[PDB]
Amino acid sequence: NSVPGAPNRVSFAKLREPLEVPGLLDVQTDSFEWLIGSPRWRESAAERGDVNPVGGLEEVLYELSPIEDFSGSMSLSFSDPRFDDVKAPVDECKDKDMTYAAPLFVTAEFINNNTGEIKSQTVFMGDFPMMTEKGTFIINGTERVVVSQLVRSPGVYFDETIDKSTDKTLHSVKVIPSRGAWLEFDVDKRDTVGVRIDRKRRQPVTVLLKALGWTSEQIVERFGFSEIMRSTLEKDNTVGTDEALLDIYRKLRPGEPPTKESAQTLLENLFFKEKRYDLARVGRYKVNKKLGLHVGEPITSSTLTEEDVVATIEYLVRLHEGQTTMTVPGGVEVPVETDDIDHFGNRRLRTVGELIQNQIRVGMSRMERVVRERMTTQDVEAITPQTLINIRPVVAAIKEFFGTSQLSQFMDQNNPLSGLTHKRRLSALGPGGLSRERAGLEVRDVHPSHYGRMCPIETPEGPNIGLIGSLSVYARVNPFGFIETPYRKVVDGVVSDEIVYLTADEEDRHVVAQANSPIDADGRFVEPRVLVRRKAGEVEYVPSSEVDYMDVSPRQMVSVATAMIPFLEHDDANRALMGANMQRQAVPLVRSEAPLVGTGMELRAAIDAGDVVVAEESGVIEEVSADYITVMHDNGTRRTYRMRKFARSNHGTCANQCPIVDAGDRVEAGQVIADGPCTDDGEMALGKNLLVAIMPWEGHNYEDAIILSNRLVEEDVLTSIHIEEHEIDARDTKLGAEEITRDIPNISDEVLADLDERGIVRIGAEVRDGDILVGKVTPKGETELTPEERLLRAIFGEKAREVRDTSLKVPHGESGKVIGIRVFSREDEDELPAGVNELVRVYVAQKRKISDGDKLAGRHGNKGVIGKILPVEDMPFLADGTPVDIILNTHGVPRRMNIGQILETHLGWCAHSGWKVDAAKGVPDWAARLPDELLEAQPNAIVSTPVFDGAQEAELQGLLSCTLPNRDGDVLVDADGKAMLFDGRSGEPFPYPVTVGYMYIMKLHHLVDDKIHARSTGPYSMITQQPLGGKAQFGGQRFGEMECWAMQAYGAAYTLQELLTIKSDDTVGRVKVYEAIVKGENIPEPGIPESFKVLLKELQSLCLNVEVLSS
Amino acid sequence: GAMLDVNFFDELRIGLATAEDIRQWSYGEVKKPETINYRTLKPEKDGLFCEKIFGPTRDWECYCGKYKRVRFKGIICERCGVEVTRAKVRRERMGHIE
Amino acid sequence: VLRGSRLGAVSYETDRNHDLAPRQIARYRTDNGEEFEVPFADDAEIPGTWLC
Amino acid sequence: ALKRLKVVAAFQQSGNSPMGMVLDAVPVIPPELRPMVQLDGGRFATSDLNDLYRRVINRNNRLKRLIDLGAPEIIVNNEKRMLQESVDALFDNGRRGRPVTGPGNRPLKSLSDLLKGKQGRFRQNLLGKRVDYSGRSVIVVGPQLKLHQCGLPKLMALELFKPFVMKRLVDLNHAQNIKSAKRMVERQRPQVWDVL
Amino acid sequence: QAITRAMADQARTIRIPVHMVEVINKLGRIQRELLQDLGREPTPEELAKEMDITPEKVLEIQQYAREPISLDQTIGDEGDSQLGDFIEDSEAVVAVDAVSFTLLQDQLQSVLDTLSEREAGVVRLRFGLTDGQPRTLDEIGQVYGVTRERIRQIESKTMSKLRHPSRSQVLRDYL
Ligand SMILES: [Zn+2]
| Beta bridge partner(s), residue A111 | A75, A118
- On the 0-12 / 13-18 / 19+ scale of CB atoms within 10 A, A448 is middle
Q: B53 C-alpha vs ligand 1 centroid, how far in Å?
A: 13
Confirm whether residue B77 is marked as ligand binding. Answer: yes
Q: Which amino acid is at C7?
A: L
Q: Which amino acid is at A508?
A: D
Contact residues, D window 132-161, toward A, CB-based 8 Å cutoff: 132-138, 140-141, 143, 153, 155-157, 159-161
Contact residues, D window 87-126, toward A, CB-based 8 Å cutoff: 91, 111-112, 114-115, 121-123, 125-126
The half-sphere exposure of A761 on its side-chain side, counting CA atoms within 13 A, is 28
CB of A408 closer than 8 Å to CB of A374: no
Give the span between the Cα atoms of A64 and A47, in whole angstroms. Answer: 29
Give the span between the Cα atoms of A484 and A502, in whole angstroms. Answer: 5
Element spanning E153, H or E: helix E148-162
Residue from A475, A581, A524 nearest A24 by CA = A475
Residue from A328, A323, A325 nearest A308 by CA = A328
Residue from E16, E20, E22 nearest E4 by CA = E22
> What does D50-87 look like in DSSP terms, one character per residue?
HHHHHHHHHHHHHHHHHHHHT--HHHHHHHHHHHHHHH
Sheet of A816-825, strands arranged across: A720-731, A836-848, A816-825, A766-767
Which of D36, D106, D176 shows the shortest C-beta gap to E173? D176
Give the span between the Cα atoms of A354 and A352, in whole angstroms. Answer: 5
**Helix (H/G/I), strand (E/B), else coil: E24:** helix
Query: Quick one: how far is CA A772 from the chain centroid?
Result: 38
Give the span between the Cα atoms of A62 and A54, in whole angstroms. Answer: 10
Residues of D in contact with A702 (CB under 8 A): 141, 143
Tell me whether strands A915-916 and A936-937 are parallel, antiparallel or unpaired: antiparallel
Q: Tell me whether residues C40 and B75 touch, CB distance under 8 A.
A: yes
Residues with Cβ within 8 Å of residue A997, at least 6 apart in sequence: A691, A692, A904, A905, A906, A907, A908, A909, A973, A977
Give the span between the Cα atoms of A542 and A539, in whole angstroms. Answer: 9
Give the span between the Cα atoms of A186 and A197, in whole angstroms. Answer: 11
Note whether D1 contacts B: Cβ–Cβ < 8 A: no
Tell me whether strands A994-1003 and A855-857 are parallel, antiparallel or unpaired: antiparallel
> What does A484-536 look like in DSSP terms, one character per residue?
EEEEEEEETTEEEEEEEEE-HHHHHHS-B--TTS-B-SSSBBSSSEEE-B-TT
Query: Quick one: how far is CA A133 from the chain centroid?
Result: 18
**Helix (H/G/I), strand (E/B), else coil: B84:** coil
Q: Which amino acid is at A285?
A: Y
Give the span between the Cα atoms of A978 and A876, in whole angstroms. Answer: 13
Please state, in angstroms and as integers, the Cα–Cα distance from residue B13 to each residue in B23, D115, D116, D120, D124, following that order: 20, 18, 20, 21, 23
Instruction: Classify each residue of A660-680 as buried b or exposed e, where b means 16 or more C-beta atoms within 10 Å of its C-beta.
Output: bbeeebebeebbbbbbbbbbb
Angle, CA of A761, A765 and A766, to the nearest 5°: 120
**Helix (H/G/I), strand (E/B), else coil: C41:** strand
Residues with Cβ within 8 Å of residue A718, at least 6 apart in sequence: A589, A688, A712, A849, A850, A856, A1003
The chains found to touch E (3+ Cβ pairs under 8 angstroms) are A, B, C, D
Query: Quick one: how far is CA A889 from the chain centroid?
Result: 34
Element spanning A1096, H or E: helix A1090-1101
CB of A810 closer than 8 Å to CB of A771: yes
Query: Quick one: how far is CA A526 from the chain centroid?
Result: 43
Residue from A1025, E11, A1032, A734 nearest C7 by CA = A734
Give the span between the Cα atoms of A415 and A423, in whole angstroms. Answer: 13
Residue from A4, A11, A2, A1 nearest A597 by CA = A11
Please state, in angstroms and as integers, the Cα–Cα distance from residue A7 to each residue in A2, A3, A529, A723, D62, following that order: 11, 9, 40, 32, 82
Instruction: Classify each residue of D97-129 as buried b or exposed e, where b means 16 or more C-beta atoms within 10 Å of its C-beta.
Output: eebbebeeeeebbbbbbbeeeeebbeebbbebb
Give the span between the Cα atoms of A508 and A452, in whole angstroms. Answer: 13
| Beta bridge partner(s), residue A541 | A531
Query: Quick one: how far is CA A170 from the chain centroid?
Result: 40
Q: Find the DSSP H helices in A809-952.
A: 900-913
Search chain B and give the residue with CA nearest D18. B16
**Helix (H/G/I), strand (E/B), else coil: A838:** strand
Q: Tell me whether residues A1021 and E84 touch, CB distance under 8 A.
A: yes
Answer left, alpha or beta for residue D132, where phi above 0 means left and psi between -120 and 50 means alpha. Answer: beta
CB of D191 closer than 8 Å to CB of D181: no
Element spanning A844, H or E: strand A836-848
Give the span between the Cα atoms of E6 and A664, in whole angstroms. Answer: 78
Backbone angles phi, psi at A943, to 5 degrees: -125, 165
Give the span between the Cα atoms of D24 and D26, in whole angstroms. Answer: 7
Give the span between the Cα atoms of A530 and A553, in whole angstroms. Answer: 16
Give the span between the Cα atoms of D25 and B28, in whole angstroms. Answer: 12
Note whether A1023 contacts E: Cβ–Cβ < 8 A: yes
Tell me whether strands A169-176 and A720-731 are parallel, antiparallel or unpaired: unpaired
Please state, in angstroms and as integers, the Cα–Cα distance from residue A905 to each residue in A690, A961, A999, B79, following that order: 10, 15, 5, 87
Resolution of this entry, Å: 2.7
Which of C7, C21, C47 shows the shortest C-beta gap to B78? C47
Angle, CA of D50, D51 and D54, to the nearest 5°: 85
Length of chain C: 52
Residues with Cβ within 8 Å of residue A467, at least 6 apart in sequence: A427, A428, A429, A434, A436, A439, A443, A444
Please state, in angstroms and as integers, the Cα–Cα distance from residue A118 to each residue in A121, A123, A381, following that order: 10, 15, 11
Backbone angles phi, psi at A890, to 5 degrees: -80, -35
- On the 0-12 / 13-18 / 19+ scale of CB atoms within 10 A, A47 is exposed
Residues of B in contact with A1100 (CB under 8 A): 17, 25, 94
Q: Which amino acid is at A108?
A: A
| Dihedral (CA of E37, E41, E46, E51) sign | positive
Note whether D35 contacts E: Cβ–Cβ < 8 A: yes
Give the span between the Cα atoms of A530 and A701, in whole angstroms. Answer: 48
Experimental method: cryo-EM
Element spanning D9, H or E: helix D2-13
CB of A946 closer than 8 Å to CB of A12: yes
Residues of B in contact with C9 (CB under 8 A): 57-59, 61, 87
CA distance D38 to chain C (A): 5
Going by the DSSP 8-state scheme, the letter that residue A785 receives in this structure is: P
Q: Find the DSSP H helices in A888-1021.
A: 900-913, 953-961, 1008-1011
CB of A286 closer than 8 Å to CB of A156: yes
Give the span between the Cα atoms of E84 and E100, in whole angstroms. Answer: 30
Q: Find the distance separating the first CA and the last CA of chain E, reported in whole Å.
A: 60
CA distance B10 to chain A (A): 5
Tell me whether strands A67-68 and A683-684 are parallel, antiparallel or unpaired: unpaired
E strands, A385-520, where? Answer: 408-410, 425-427, 468-470, 476-477, 483-491, 494-502
Please state, in angstroms and as integers, the Cα–Cα distance from residue A165 to each residue in A187, A188, A189, A231, E110, following that order: 15, 12, 9, 22, 92
Q: Tell me whether residues C12 and E91 touch, CB distance under 8 A.
A: no
Residue from A1070, A1069, A1081 nearest A1018 by CA = A1070
Q: Tell me whether residues E88 and C8 touch, CB distance under 8 A.
A: no
Three-state secondary structure string covering A69-110: CCCCCEEEEEEEEEECCCCCCHHHHHHCCCCCEEEEEEEEEE
Angle, CA of A169, A170 and A174, to the nearest 5°: 140
| Dihedral (CA of A290, A295, A298, A302) sign | negative
Confirm whether residue B80 is marked as ligand binding. Answer: yes
CB of C11 closer than 8 Å to CB of A783: no
